[PDB]
Amino acid sequence: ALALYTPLPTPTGWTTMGDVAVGDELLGADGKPTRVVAATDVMLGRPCYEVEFSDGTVIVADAAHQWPTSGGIRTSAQLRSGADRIVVAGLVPVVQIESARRVASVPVRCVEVDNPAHLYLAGRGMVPTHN
């Protein structure tokens, strides 16, 4: 799950995780539209991590949120500053993880998309992440 204030890119603009509705279009890792097919309620009290990327994108996510990295799937809590790179199989890394750290809990929410790779883009830098 991602913080409600996370901006998510869409084919026409930007939404937030808090504002996104089932049936909205997000972006897959291929940069093409992918539909939100399900979403959770707002979840409160979850342990959260702040993840900073090499492009300046910052995303707050819950500890168990999963990311596509050079060494496989990693939860937020297992990302390694200055080592992990966000990569999507077909080679080229999208960004490097600059910092990942525990922060105070904020409201978060999950979405599921219809992308067969289970990926959508998140943050101002449009970083691939797992639903």
Residue numbers in the entry: 1 to 90, 105 to 145
Question: Can you provide the manuscript's text about this entry?
Answer:
Protein splicing is catalyzed by intervening protein sequences termed inteins. The protein-splicing reaction involves the self-removal of the intein and concomitant joining of the two flanking sequences (exteins). All splicing domains found among inteins have the same structural architecture named HINT (Hedgehog/INTein) which relates to the C-terminal domain of the Hedgehog protein (Hh–C or hog domain). Instead of the N-terminal serine or cysteine missing among class 3 inteins, class 3 inteins contain an additional nucleophilic cysteine residue in block F.
We determined the high-resolution crystal structures of two variants of the class 3 MchDnaB1 intein (MchDnaB1_HN and MchDnaB1_HAA). We found that the most striking feature of the crystal structures of the MchDnaB1 intein is the active site, closely resembling the catalytic triad of serine/cysteine proteases. The WCT motif found in the class 3 intein participates in forming the catalytic triad, in which Cys124, His65, and Thr143 could serve as nucleophilic, basic, and acidic functional groups, respectively. Importantly, we could observe clear electron density near the side-chains of Cys124, His65, and the backbone of Val125 for both crystal structures of the MchDnaDB1_HN and MchDnaB1_HAA inteins (modeled as oxyanion waters in Figure 2a and Supplemental Figure S2). However, the crystal structures of both MchDnaB1 intein variants (HN and HAA at the C-terminus) lacked electron densities for the N-extein sequences. This observation is presumably due to self-cleavage at the N-terminus during sample preparation and/or crystallization (N-cleavage). We observed electron density for both the gauche+ and trans-like conformations of Cys124 in the crystal structure of MchDnaB1_HN, although the side-chain conformation of Cys124 in the trans-like conformation is less evident in the second molecule (chain B) in the asymmetric unit. Upon removal of the N-extein in the simulation, the population largely shifted towards the ideal gauche+ conformation with χ1 = ~300° (−60°), with more frequent rotation between gauche+ and trans-like conformations. This observation might suggest that both crystal structures represent the post-splicing or post-cleavage status as expected from the primary structure of the variants. The intein will reach the ground state (gauche+ conformation of Cys124), represented by the crystal structure of MchDnaB1_HN.
